[PDB]
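ugh ok so i messed up the first submission bc i forgot one of the chains. this is the corrected input, ALL of the components this time, i swear. 649 residues overall. if the numbers dont match what u have on ur side tell me asap before i send this to the collaborators (the ones from the other lab, u know who)
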Amino acid sequence: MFRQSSEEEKKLYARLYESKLSFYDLPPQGEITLEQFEIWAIDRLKILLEIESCLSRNKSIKEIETIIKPQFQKLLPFNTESLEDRKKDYYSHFILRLCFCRSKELREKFVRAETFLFKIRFNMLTSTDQTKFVQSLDLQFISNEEKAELSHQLYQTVSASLQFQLNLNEEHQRKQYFQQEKFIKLPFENVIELVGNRLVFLKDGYAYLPQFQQLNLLSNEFASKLNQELIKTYQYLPRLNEDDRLLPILNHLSSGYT
Amino acid sequence: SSDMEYYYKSLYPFKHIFNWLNHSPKPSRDMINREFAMAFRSGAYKRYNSFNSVQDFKAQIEKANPDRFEIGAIYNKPPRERDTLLKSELKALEKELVFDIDMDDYDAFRTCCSGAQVCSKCWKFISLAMKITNTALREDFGYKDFIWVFSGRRGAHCWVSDKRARALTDVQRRNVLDYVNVIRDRNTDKRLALKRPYHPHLARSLEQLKPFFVSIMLEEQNPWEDDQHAIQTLLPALYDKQLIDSLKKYWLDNPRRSSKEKWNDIDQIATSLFKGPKQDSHIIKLRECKEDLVLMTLYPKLDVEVTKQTIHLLKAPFCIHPATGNVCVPIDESFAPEKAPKLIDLQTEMEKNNDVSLTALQPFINQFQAYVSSLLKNELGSVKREREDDD
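and heres the new structure output, hopefully the right one now
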């Protein structure tokens, strides 16, 4: 049969937003303006302020999504090819690190708001984008034999969840989906919130988690790594103090949360 | 006060308790930084005691001579040096995952005794609760290093000392408690909130408790022989209003039918009422209500305050109960409170023999020694496995 046969910064951000979401993993490079610094930080701050306001009002995920999604196109665009939007998102997050690393209360509030925004944006993805984003983060499925041996217990665990979360009222549909569903084994301490609600099957200190659940692990890893980075960002705040022109902006940004 | 001094100087097993709490024959932070609290006959209560060694532990408890002392969390720094620290600088690192069961929580269905009084007839509640809890700890969580302890008058305390169990955070402890807490509302005027089909924990617990429902609830205790108590506790667990009204009317016309008779009357009247194509669904719902009643009556009942915080303090093993005089001995599922030793009896036996091994306390000390030996062996094995994994 017949057969034939700075740029680096732009490539870096194209790589970082190929998945459409990021753990905000790497040091930015090059330059932006100070007006851009202030405005981008304030835009992300406004979105996170509304997220914290809705959570203090005890609104659900669907209501918060209805409230926040129109604001991305104005303040912080998502699901976009634009280099400007991608840099805006990345730099705004990194600025609010320096604003909110200063104290435990600020770190907790920033981690909570940013993790909830991470959850919202993850919900906006297609399943293919979610799979690719999870795989890019380098994030144990059980064998078919182990699934067969534990099939009764796993099906008893997930059958109600399949009906209520995936709307599979028919038992026939639930059985077919369960036949097609994969499960993850890990220590029970890692998914303890699902353990307290009895949403996972426990055996010998290991929790058995279906594939259609487990986003709390992703968001918890995001929150934990963000907290560790904020603790690190706190430790080298004395290097931030070499430029006086940034401190009034950060004080202004933090004043809205105090 | 003199009896307690004699007890600490002659009878208390300080060495085995030190090995349990220290997790090592030689001293470590698990004892140096562990908080202990002492309660006194004057009404005083002193927190933030900690001990450098078994000799220091024994000497300080003997010198203070409290009515009892309580065990707390392992800290980052010695609690006895709290005067050198700000309150925010002394922080917890570990504590044994502890569960507390009280007999008084079963007075909704107990009849032979009420309140803090106990007897072997009602302790089958605690025995079944211990059995279900042990099944959960071994099969679900994979724990092995745990032991049950009699509270002295009315309850049982399980002290889980597995390294993964000791390291649980407050959030993790609360979620574990929620996992094992099934009857989350003690009020009797509703059916349980449990979803269907059962989680495997609930199904296994129900199958373990089914053989004992008749003999204990319907026959031994027999709480529903009183018609008003049945109307207030048994009927609200049922799913249908017409069934409840029919049973209420029938029992008011035919009073003082026993719990077994009422349990059969439910089936008979439901069969009489729910004829037709929907009969199978009504039978299934009735069976669901009876299964939920078994769980409502016999499942473990727990004090959340003991488990929901790492820093909590609880009465230590082998303490003396101030009112009853019983020793807070280790126990197993075959225990009853009548088998516990007492301080006065142990003093008499020591006066007669002058040897702890010839007293009634020595089988319980043997149980605790075997538990400590197994705990230390598993700790050393865990350290070896961790070192091999690091290598």
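quick check: The radius of gyration of chain B is 24 Å. that seems consistent at least. Residues 380 and 386 of chain B are 10 Å apart (CA to CA).
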